[PDB]
């Protein structure tokens, strides 16, 4: 999946869904470095409790420490509504939602 921050990471590498935090690595000094990541987009629509079938363009996520401290100072691209509300830190750096 692509990285959802301005850190410049080419891609992210490790079921986990949007808003779930799992260990992740920056596939492409950061090689083979494990750090928790939060998924902000998955490019798939699920049965939302609000009844609206959300959609995204591509899978994306953010890499942060266990407490969720965003590595970058901003988030590139839209962020899932559930993920943004779940994590206040993500919302602070989030620019657009969906």
């Amino acid at each position: 999946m692509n990285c959802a921050d301005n850190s410049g990471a080419r891609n992210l590498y490790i079921a986990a869904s949007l808003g779930d935090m799992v260990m992740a690595t920056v596939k492409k000094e950061l090689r083979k470095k494990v750090m928790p990541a939060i998924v902000v987009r998955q490019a798939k629509s699920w049965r939302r409790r609000d009844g609206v079938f959300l959609y995204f363009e591509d899978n994306a996520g953010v890499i942060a420490n266990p407490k969720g401290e965003m590595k970058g100072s901003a988030i590139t691209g839209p962020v899932g509504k559930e993920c943004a509300d779940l994590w206040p830190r993500v919302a602070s750096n989030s620019g657009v939602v969906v």
Binding site: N6, D50, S73, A74, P78, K81, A84, D85, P88, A91, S92, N93, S94, G95, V96, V97, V98
Partner: protein, 217 residues
């Protein structure tokens, strides 16, 4: 005066709050502590509105307005806009931004007289009745705060930018941290001309700086 409060054991008051001289916006929830945060100093002096933007608790991050008006992003639903209109008097102007964007509180920081943003400028000026003009910050709103008495910015703000804004704002500006060194000044506290709310992590030096900049004493 400045007050130390919390929300769901979280010190990010600004994320779930937006204070104004005539009203206050807070996220929906049964946590009496959050309501007490604003009710302790002034009781029921000004109304407190429990609502949300796009059905989220980040209303504080998604809302950017002053005592004279309020603004909400496109993601805001019609029902939420109607609830906000019913919860505020006709004096406060409420309008929806139709531009492609969602984070208004993280991009726009303004007070009752001046507004700073990253056409929509005319709409912002009309709704808030303020002049529309920070140190290269990607998200000025998330790392800035303002009030008629004064304003607070992130510690990394350049001295030149602070001086220019203070000269334009006609009031002094001070850069400091919140919530025990946290650099998100706009997410850890919300202040008005006579009441400042800060999280528990806010240390004594930060509280003193907040009190001094707004010159309550």
């Amino acid at each position: 005066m400045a007050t130390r409060t919390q929300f769901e054991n979280s010190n990010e008051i600004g994320v779930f709050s937006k204070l104004t001289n005539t009203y206050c916006l807070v996220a929906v929830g049964g946590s009496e502590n959050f309501y007490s945060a604003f009710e302790a100093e002034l009781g029921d002096a000004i109304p407190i509105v429990h609502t949300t933007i796009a059905g989220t608790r980040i209303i504080g991050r998604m809302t950017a307005g002053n005592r004279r008006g309020l603004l909400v992003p496109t993601q805001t639903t019609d029902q939420e806009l109607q609830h906000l209109r019913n919860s505020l008097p006709d004096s406060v102007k409420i309008q929806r931004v139709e531009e492609r964007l969602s984070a208004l509180g993280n991009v726009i920081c303004c007070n009752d007289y001046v507004a700073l943003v990253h056409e929509t400028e005319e709409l912002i000026s009309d709704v808030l009745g303020v002049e529309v003009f920070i140190s290269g910050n990607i998200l000025v709103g998330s790392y800035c705060s303002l009030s008629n008495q004064g304003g607070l910015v992130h510690p990394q703000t350049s001295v030149q930018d602070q001086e220019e804004l203070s000269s334009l704002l006609q009031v002094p500006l001070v850069a400091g941290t919140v919530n025990r060194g946290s650099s998100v000044v706009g997410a850890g506290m919300v202040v008005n001309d006579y009441l400042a709310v800060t999280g528990l992590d806010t240390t004594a030096p930060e509280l003193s700086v907040i009190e001094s900049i707004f010159r309550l004493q």
